[PDB]
Amino acid sequence: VAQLTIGNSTITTQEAANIIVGYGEWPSYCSDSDATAVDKPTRPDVSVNRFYTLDTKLWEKSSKGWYWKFPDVLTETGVFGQNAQFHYLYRSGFCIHVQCNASKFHQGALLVAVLPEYVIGTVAGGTGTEDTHPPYKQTQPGADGFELQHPYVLDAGIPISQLTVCPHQWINLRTNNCATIIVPYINALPFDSALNHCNFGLLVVPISPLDYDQGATPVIPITITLAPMCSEFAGLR
Amino acid sequence: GFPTELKPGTNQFLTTDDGVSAPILPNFHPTPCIHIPGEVRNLLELCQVETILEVNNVPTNATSLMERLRFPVSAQAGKGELCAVFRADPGRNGPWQSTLLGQLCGYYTQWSGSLEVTFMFTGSFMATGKMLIAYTPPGGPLPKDRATAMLGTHVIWDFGLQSSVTLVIPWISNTHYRAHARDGVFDYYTTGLVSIWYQTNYVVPIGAPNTAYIIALAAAQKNFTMKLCKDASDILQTG
Amino acid sequence: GFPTELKPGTNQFLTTDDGVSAPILPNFHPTPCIHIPGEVRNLLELCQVETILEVNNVPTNATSLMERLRFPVSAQAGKGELCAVFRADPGRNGPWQSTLLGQLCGYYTQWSGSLEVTFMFTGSFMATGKMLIAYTPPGGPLPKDRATAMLGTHVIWDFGLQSSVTLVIPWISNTHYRAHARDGVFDYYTTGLVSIWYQTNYVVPIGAPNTAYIIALAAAQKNFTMKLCKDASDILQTG
Amino acid sequence: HSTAETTLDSFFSRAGLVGEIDLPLKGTTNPNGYANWDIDITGYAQMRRKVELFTYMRFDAEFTFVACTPTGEVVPQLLQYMFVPPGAPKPDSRESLAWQTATNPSVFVKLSDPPAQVSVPFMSPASAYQWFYDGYPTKDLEYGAMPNNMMGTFSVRTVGTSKSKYPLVVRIYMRMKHVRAWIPRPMRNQNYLFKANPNYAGNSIKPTGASRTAITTL
Amino acid sequence: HSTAETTLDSFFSRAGLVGEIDLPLKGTTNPNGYANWDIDITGYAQMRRKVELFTYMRFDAEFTFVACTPTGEVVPQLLQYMFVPPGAPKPDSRESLAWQTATNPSVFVKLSDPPAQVSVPFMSPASAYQWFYDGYPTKDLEYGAMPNNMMGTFSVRTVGTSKSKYPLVVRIYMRMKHVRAWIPRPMRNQNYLFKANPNYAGNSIKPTGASRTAITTL
Incomplete structure (x- = not known):
C-alpha cells in the first residue's frame, strides 16, 4: 500500500494490482503532420490532468448496474470541463480506477469494462412500434452516471454475457476490490467534439449480486476516480 | 487480331468469383486510413476470448435473465450431490449460445479444437469447501455418482484456496454429418460432458451468506479452427 | 486461337473511362506546339492569385456595381464602431463569389487550406488612424464589441504607417455533409468570421476628403486543395 | 491446420443481394420508368448483425447488376445505371438533367449483355x-x-x-x-x-439462447 | 495531400454530350435521312465557360457515338458516320459523292454493335x-x-x-x-x-454574386 499524487490530488491506493491497458495501446499525443498543424493544439499538464473522484455510487442487492459517458462525465466537472466546453476539438486518454470498500463478509462480482461508441437504445414503446429516441439524461448522464434497466442486453440489444470482449476487469469481493483501466483515444478521426460525441462509456455491473447477513453494512460504496492522459484541445471560444 | 476460343462459363455471374471490376471513380483518392486501436484480423482471435457461459440457462422470466449468468452453491447441498452439468457443444443450443464462441460457430459449418472453461467463485471470502469437476469424454455417460466421477478425468476445487480454476476440454469435433428430417445438419455427437459435484459441503462462519454463485467463462485454445462459411440467423434486418 | 472469357462490363460505355480509341487520321501530323507565355498546368495556381473580394456586396443598382469592390471608412464613424464583417466561406454565396477562388470552388465539391485576405487603404495620403481586424474561428459568435474582439485573434492596422495589411485565415474546411431539402450539399459550418472595427476614428487635416475606401483581395495559401469535379453553373451556352 | 476461412475478408466476401428495383408498366410502383436506390448494405438481411460485430470498418464494394422481366426473361432493351456520389443531386424525374451530369458515373448495357459490374471506393x-x-x-x-x-x-x-x-x-x-x-x-x-x-x-x-428445465438435466 | 484532381486534364476529362441527331421517318427535321454536324464543343452547355477561362488551348477529342430509336430501342440497322475534315466538302444530299470520298474517314457500325469510338487530332x-x-x-x-x-x-x-x-x-x-x-x-x-x-x-x-443588406450584417 502507498499513495500517489498528481498536483493537489492525493489518493490512497493499493501498490499495483493488474492494470488493463485497453487494446494494448497507451494514450499518446498526436504529431505535427496532422489535419490542423497551424492551430497548434495546446496540451494541458498543470491542473487539467489530475485525480477526479466522482460521487460514490452505493451498491445494493437490487442494483442493476451503472454507466457513465466520456468525455461527458467531465465536461461538467472542474477545469477540465472548462477546456472541453470552450474549445473546438478534443482527444484524450484515460486512467480509470474503481474501488469498493467491503468487509470480508460481503460477496459480489462486478464486471467493469469500457465500450467505444456506447449507443443507448430504449424499450421503443414496449410492443416494438414506437420509434422513441433515448433522452439527453440517458445519453449523457454526467458525473452521477445512470442505471441500466435491462442489464442482460445492456440497454442496447447486446448480450452482456459477451461484454468481456471489451477492455474489462473483474472485481470479485473475495479477492480484490480495486480495478484499473488505461484507455487510449479511440475514434475514426484524430480529433472531435467533446460535447457532441462520447467516444466511449464506462460500464460497471453486478454479475454476482451483493449479499450479506443482516447486520453488516447493506450498501457497498463504489468509488470511481479517474485521470486524463495526454489530453489535447484546439480552437478556443 | 489475336486468335481465341471462348470456353464454357463465359458470361456467367458467380456470386463467389473474386475477379476485378472497373473502378467507378478512377480519380478519387479515398480519405487515408489512420491508426485505430484494436484491429481484428482473423475471427479466431475472438474465439480465444473468455465470454460468460450461461450454464444456468433455465430462467426465462424477463427480469431473471441476469440469473442465467451465474449458478449457485449452498449449505443445503449435501456432500456428493450433483451441483450442475452441461455438454461441450459450442455450436449447439444451450449454454454455449451465450458465449461469443458459440455465436461465431453459427456462421460456420464445421470446427475443432481444445476448449477451456474457467470457473469463478463469487461467494463471501469467509466461505470454504471443495467441488469436484469432472469431464466425461464423448460417449461416456454422465457418471452415476461423485465417486464414479471421481475415477474419471476430474479436478478437486477448493475455493477456500483459489477463487478461480480453469478446465481444459482436450477436444471437440463437429465433423460427423447427419441427415435427419430432410434437412442435413453437420452435428456433434462429441457431446463431451462436464459434471460438477459437491465434494464437501458449503462451510461458513456466522455472519456470512449461506449461498454464493459461480461464473462460467469459456473460450477456445489457439488450436481452434472453423470451416465452411454459413450465414444463418434468427435476427435479421426488419422491413 | 487464344482462349478467353468476357467479363461483365463488356460492351459498356463509361463516360469516364479513359481508354484509347482509333485515330481517325493516322497520317496527319498536327501543327507543332510552339512556346506561348503563361501556360497553366494546375488550377490551384489560379487559386493562389489575389482577386478583388466584393465585401461590400450590397448595391445592385446597375451603375453602382463598381461600388461592391470597395467599402469605406469616414470621420463620422466613432471609435469602436463595427466597420464591416463577413465569413470565410470561399464557395458559398456572398463576397467570395467575386474572387476567382470562389468561382473555381464552384466546379468542385470539397476543399481545404489556409486563406489570405489583404486590405488596401486607398484614401488620401494625409489620413491616419487605426482599424482593428479580428478573426473569430468557426463557432465563435461575432464579438459583441471592439474590446471583446480585441481579446480574439486580432490585428491593429495603422494605415498611417502601412497602406496594406494581409490577414491569414489558418483554416477553412468544407467537409461536413448536409442533406437539407432533399438536395444533398457538402456545406461549410466553418464560417470563420472576420470583423473590422474602428479602433480610433478617421483623422485628417483640412484639405483632405473625410472618406476613403478600402479594397479586399483574397487568395489561398499553397496548402489549398479541392476534390470532386462538379460542373455547375447558372451561365450556359444559349440555344 | 489452415485458418484462411476465419479471416475478415473470407467472412465478408461473396456478392450478396442488397437491392431489387421494380419497373412495371402499369403500376403504383415507380410510375416514371426510373428509380433511385441509396446504397444500403443492410439490404442483405444477414448482413447487419455480421458487420455490427465491429465498431469501425473499411472496404470496397463490387456491384453486379442483374436485370430481366418478372419471369426472368431477357429482352432487347437498353438501360442506364447512374451512380450519384454523396453530395450529388439525385434525379427527381425521368428527364432530370442529373442523368446527363458527367460527374455522375453512368454505365449503359443491354439486357442481353451479361451483368454490369463496377467497383466503388471507400467514400466516407x-x-x-x-x-x-x-x-x-x-x-x-x-x-x-x-x-x-x-x-x-x-x-x-x-x-x-x-x-x-x-x-x-x-x-x-x-x-x-x-x-x-x-x-x-x-x-x-x-x-x-x-x-x-x-x-x-x-x-x-x-x-x-435455448433454455432448459434444470441445471442438472441435459 | 494530393492535387491530381485540380489539373487541367482532370478538369476537362469526362466524355460529355455535345451533339444529338434526329432522323425521323415523317418529319420536318432532316427529311433526307441524313445530317451534317459541324463540331461544336460548346454542345455541352457547361463547357463554354470552362474553356473560356483560358485564352489559348490545345487537345485531342475522343468521340463516342450512341444510336437508338427515340424510346432508346436497338434495331438491325447499319449506319455510316463520316468525318469531313475542315476544307473538305460536306454532302448536300443523301447521294452526294462525298459519302464515297476516301479522304473523308468513315466508320460503319450496326446499332447492335456497341458504341462507335474514334480519336480526332489537333486540327488547327x-x-x-x-x-x-x-x-x-x-x-x-x-x-x-x-x-x-x-x-x-x-x-x-x-x-x-x-x-x-x-x-x-x-x-x-x-x-x-x-x-x-x-x-x-x-x-x-x-x-x-x-x-x-x-x-x-x-x-x-x-x-x-449574391447580394446582402448591409456590410455589417451576415
Whole structure:
C-alpha cells in the first residue's frame, strides 16, 4: 500500500494490482503532420490532468448496474470541463480506477469494462412500434452516471454475457476490490467534439449480486476516480 | 487480331468469383486510413476470448435473465450431490449460445479444437469447501455418482484456496454429418460432458451468506479452427 | 486461337473511362506546339492569385456595381464602431463569389487550406488612424464589441504607417455533409468570421476628403486543395 | 491446420443481394420508368448483425447488376445505371438533367449483355465507416447518426425518351472487398426494430439462447 | 495531400454530350435521312465557360457515338458516320459523292454493335485553338472570328440506297484529352447571348454574386 499524487490530488491506493491497458495501446499525443498543424493544439499538464473522484455510487442487492459517458462525465466537472466546453476539438486518454470498500463478509462480482461508441437504445414503446429516441439524461448522464434497466442486453440489444470482449476487469469481493483501466483515444478521426460525441462509456455491473447477513453494512460504496492522459484541445471560444 | 476460343462459363455471374471490376471513380483518392486501436484480423482471435457461459440457462422470466449468468452453491447441498452439468457443444443450443464462441460457430459449418472453461467463485471470502469437476469424454455417460466421477478425468476445487480454476476440454469435433428430417445438419455427437459435484459441503462462519454463485467463462485454445462459411440467423434486418 | 472469357462490363460505355480509341487520321501530323507565355498546368495556381473580394456586396443598382469592390471608412464613424464583417466561406454565396477562388470552388465539391485576405487603404495620403481586424474561428459568435474582439485573434492596422495589411485565415474546411431539402450539399459550418472595427476614428487635416475606401483581395495559401469535379453553373451556352 | 476461412475478408466476401428495383408498366410502383436506390448494405438481411460485430470498418464494394422481366426473361432493351456520389443531386424525374451530369458515373448495357459490374471506393470523408455513433451532429432524433457513412445513390432507368415496352426488374448484388475492422463488440442477441437505431422490444426481451428445465438435466 | 484532381486534364476529362441527331421517318427535321454536324464543343452547355477561362488551348477529342430509336430501342440497322475534315466538302444530299470520298474517314457500325469510338487530332493550322481573337481576318461582322479553330464536320446517315425503316437518334459524346492551356482570364460573370461573340445584355447587368443588406450584417 502507498499513495500517489498528481498536483493537489492525493489518493490512497493499493501498490499495483493488474492494470488493463485497453487494446494494448497507451494514450499518446498526436504529431505535427496532422489535419490542423497551424492551430497548434495546446496540451494541458498543470491542473487539467489530475485525480477526479466522482460521487460514490452505493451498491445494493437490487442494483442493476451503472454507466457513465466520456468525455461527458467531465465536461461538467472542474477545469477540465472548462477546456472541453470552450474549445473546438478534443482527444484524450484515460486512467480509470474503481474501488469498493467491503468487509470480508460481503460477496459480489462486478464486471467493469469500457465500450467505444456506447449507443443507448430504449424499450421503443414496449410492443416494438414506437420509434422513441433515448433522452439527453440517458445519453449523457454526467458525473452521477445512470442505471441500466435491462442489464442482460445492456440497454442496447447486446448480450452482456459477451461484454468481456471489451477492455474489462473483474472485481470479485473475495479477492480484490480495486480495478484499473488505461484507455487510449479511440475514434475514426484524430480529433472531435467533446460535447457532441462520447467516444466511449464506462460500464460497471453486478454479475454476482451483493449479499450479506443482516447486520453488516447493506450498501457497498463504489468509488470511481479517474485521470486524463495526454489530453489535447484546439480552437478556443 | 489475336486468335481465341471462348470456353464454357463465359458470361456467367458467380456470386463467389473474386475477379476485378472497373473502378467507378478512377480519380478519387479515398480519405487515408489512420491508426485505430484494436484491429481484428482473423475471427479466431475472438474465439480465444473468455465470454460468460450461461450454464444456468433455465430462467426465462424477463427480469431473471441476469440469473442465467451465474449458478449457485449452498449449505443445503449435501456432500456428493450433483451441483450442475452441461455438454461441450459450442455450436449447439444451450449454454454455449451465450458465449461469443458459440455465436461465431453459427456462421460456420464445421470446427475443432481444445476448449477451456474457467470457473469463478463469487461467494463471501469467509466461505470454504471443495467441488469436484469432472469431464466425461464423448460417449461416456454422465457418471452415476461423485465417486464414479471421481475415477474419471476430474479436478478437486477448493475455493477456500483459489477463487478461480480453469478446465481444459482436450477436444471437440463437429465433423460427423447427419441427415435427419430432410434437412442435413453437420452435428456433434462429441457431446463431451462436464459434471460438477459437491465434494464437501458449503462451510461458513456466522455472519456470512449461506449461498454464493459461480461464473462460467469459456473460450477456445489457439488450436481452434472453423470451416465452411454459413450465414444463418434468427435476427435479421426488419422491413 | 487464344482462349478467353468476357467479363461483365463488356460492351459498356463509361463516360469516364479513359481508354484509347482509333485515330481517325493516322497520317496527319498536327501543327507543332510552339512556346506561348503563361501556360497553366494546375488550377490551384489560379487559386493562389489575389482577386478583388466584393465585401461590400450590397448595391445592385446597375451603375453602382463598381461600388461592391470597395467599402469605406469616414470621420463620422466613432471609435469602436463595427466597420464591416463577413465569413470565410470561399464557395458559398456572398463576397467570395467575386474572387476567382470562389468561382473555381464552384466546379468542385470539397476543399481545404489556409486563406489570405489583404486590405488596401486607398484614401488620401494625409489620413491616419487605426482599424482593428479580428478573426473569430468557426463557432465563435461575432464579438459583441471592439474590446471583446480585441481579446480574439486580432490585428491593429495603422494605415498611417502601412497602406496594406494581409490577414491569414489558418483554416477553412468544407467537409461536413448536409442533406437539407432533399438536395444533398457538402456545406461549410466553418464560417470563420472576420470583423473590422474602428479602433480610433478617421483623422485628417483640412484639405483632405473625410472618406476613403478600402479594397479586399483574397487568395489561398499553397496548402489549398479541392476534390470532386462538379460542373455547375447558372451561365450556359444559349440555344 | 489452415485458418484462411476465419479471416475478415473470407467472412465478408461473396456478392450478396442488397437491392431489387421494380419497373412495371402499369403500376403504383415507380410510375416514371426510373428509380433511385441509396446504397444500403443492410439490404442483405444477414448482413447487419455480421458487420455490427465491429465498431469501425473499411472496404470496397463490387456491384453486379442483374436485370430481366418478372419471369426472368431477357429482352432487347437498353438501360442506364447512374451512380450519384454523396453530395450529388439525385434525379427527381425521368428527364432530370442529373442523368446527363458527367460527374455522375453512368454505365449503359443491354439486357442481353451479361451483368454490369463496377467497383466503388471507400467514400466516407472519415477514416472509417462506423456502425455506432454515441452523439449528435453539431432527447433528440439525430442520435446515433454518422452521416459520413453514405456511399451514394444508384439511379436506374430505361434508356430513351419514352417508357420502356417491357416490365423490368433489376437486382443489385454487392461483394465487399479489402476489409479492415476495429473494436469488436457483443453480438446482437435481440431482434432489430429499426434500420437506424439499436432500439429493441422491452417486453419481448428473450434469452440469448435455448433454455432448459434444470441445471442438472441435459 | 494530393492535387491530381485540380489539373487541367482532370478538369476537362469526362466524355460529355455535345451533339444529338434526329432522323425521323415523317418529319420536318432532316427529311433526307441524313445530317451534317459541324463540331461544336460548346454542345455541352457547361463547357463554354470552362474553356473560356483560358485564352489559348490545345487537345485531342475522343468521340463516342450512341444510336437508338427515340424510346432508346436497338434495331438491325447499319449506319455510316463520316468525318469531313475542315476544307473538305460536306454532302448536300443523301447521294452526294462525298459519302464515297476516301479522304473523308468513315466508320460503319450496326446499332447492335456497341458504341462507335474514334480519336480526332489537333486540327488547327495555328499552334493552338484560341477562344478569343481581337481583330478581323484579312464596325464589322468578322470581329472575333478565328476560323482556324474548325475541327471539322460529322456527317451521319443510314446505310443503303433507301430511307431507313426506323426513326433514329444519334448522340455524340466527346472526351477532351492531352490538354494544354495558356493565358488565364476572368470567369464569365454575365449570361451568354450568342455562340460567336461575348456580347451581353446591357440592361440586365447582374452582380457577379449574391447580394446582402448591409456590410455589417451576415
